[PDB]
Design a protein around this ligand. Sequence first.
Ligand SMILES: Cc1cc2nc3c(=O)[nH]c(=O)nc-3n(C[C@H](O)[C@H](O)[C@H](O)COP(=O)(O)O)c2cc1C
Ligand SMILES: Cc1cc2nc3c(=O)[nH]c(=O)nc-3n(C[C@H](O)[C@H](O)[C@H](O)COP(=O)(O)O)c2cc1C
Ligand code: NI
Lengths: 210, 207
Amino acid sequence: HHHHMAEFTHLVNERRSASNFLSGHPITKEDLNEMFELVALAPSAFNLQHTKYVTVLDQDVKEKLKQAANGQYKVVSSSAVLLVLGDKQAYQQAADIYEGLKVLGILNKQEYDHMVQDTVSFYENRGEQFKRDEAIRNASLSAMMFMLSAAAAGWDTCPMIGFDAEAVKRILNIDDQFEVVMMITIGKEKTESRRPRGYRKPVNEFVEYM
Amino acid sequence: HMAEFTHLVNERRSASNFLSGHPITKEDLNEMFELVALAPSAFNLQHTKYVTVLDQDVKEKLKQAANGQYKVVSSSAVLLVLGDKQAYQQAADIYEGLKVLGILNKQEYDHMVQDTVSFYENRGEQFKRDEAIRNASLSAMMFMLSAAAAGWDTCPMIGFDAEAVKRILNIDDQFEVVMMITIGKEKTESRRPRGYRKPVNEFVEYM
Ligand SMILES: Cc1cc2nc3c(=O)[nH]c(=O)nc-3n(C[C@H](O)[C@H](O)[C@H](O)COP(=O)(O)O)c2cc1C
Ligand SMILES: Cc1cc2nc3c(=O)[nH]c(=O)nc-3n(C[C@H](O)[C@H](O)[C@H](O)COP(=O)(O)O)c2cc1C
Ligand code: NI
């Protein structure tokens, strides 16, 4: 129970949003799949698991994403570029996600139908804006987990919103039901060349106790 | 760090209940928030604010706004995670040290401020709100992992009436109420298995 805070504190202190990446650091599907096993364990509303990742390793495709990413060269120099997607229709998979509860005899048919109905109606009652909010919220929780996993694995990342979402969707053939919530580059940054961390507001300027 | 973080992640479970007799202090929370401060945020604008409720009557008010959920009152504290829809307005203040300490000249500083401000202004109100949710949600995940690392359990929650919460806590309409997070110590023997998880090859595609 005893040393988890100090380890985590070091991980968090060492994580810097990359401004550059270095060549000669290829990343493999195996490297990434280890990070994604941790991402799978992120919390998500109603366990709907809203988040999808399109992970681009192909250098020609990365070159082609540069214009879409507001000209940011780090898309090219990165080892991989991830598009973090949120399903605006995530709630439609409630019936499938919850089905094992029925098969394992944890819920009976009525209870399972009720649970699916609670989740679906929560979303449908609130409407389209809420569905999109949920896409952004749940994918962003997931993205933070991705970045800390990457850091733990010894990789650098830069989260990015400086891109044309529509262009990215056309280039990568992403369906309409997915919001492009963020882009994350991953790779190895030269540490000697890093600027110091940007100014942070003190805790007493962003937390109110009541 | 991978073995330790893997352990932390694997352990972390959204709490269904909280035990009595585990008060949390400002000192405890401030330790967590120091890590939260180091989360990334777009343009380093630091969009997120936390309203941290220890007062038991306010928790009762919040419970009424959250479908009567008992964990609101049995929690050691209830946090409201806010995102500032007007965060971009503080660019000039946040970047000011770069100029004053001579890292940037005035032209470069003005250019930096204008780049951030115009990015938000040119996109518009829906974007500002999207940014409030996105950056606050990144922050919330950091908060939950920080709490885990400190030995606390949390439950993220969206099952509440946001307008009722803003009335209870006197929250300006400039802030989006992004999430509620309860914190405390869970009865760990009282724990259902982790809800089914999609395999990685069902949520990741490579190109
Ligand atoms: C949602 C979001 C969007 C971002 N977009 C970009 C971007 O498009 N390009 C970029 O270079 N950095 C981007 N960043 C990185 C921020 O500038 C960075 O997190 C901030 O300056 C703090 O740096 P640090 O994370 O190293 O402390 C983004 C960060 C966030 C979380
Ligand atoms: C944004 C979002 C909203 C949530 N809202 C609630 C809620 O209002 N009430 C609740 O009991 N749990 C809530 N949760 C918890 C989820 O049901 C939980 O994360 C999921 O079932 C998986 O459990 P696990 O995180 O322990 O693996 C929420 C989770 C997410 C991230
Ligand atoms: Ni542990």
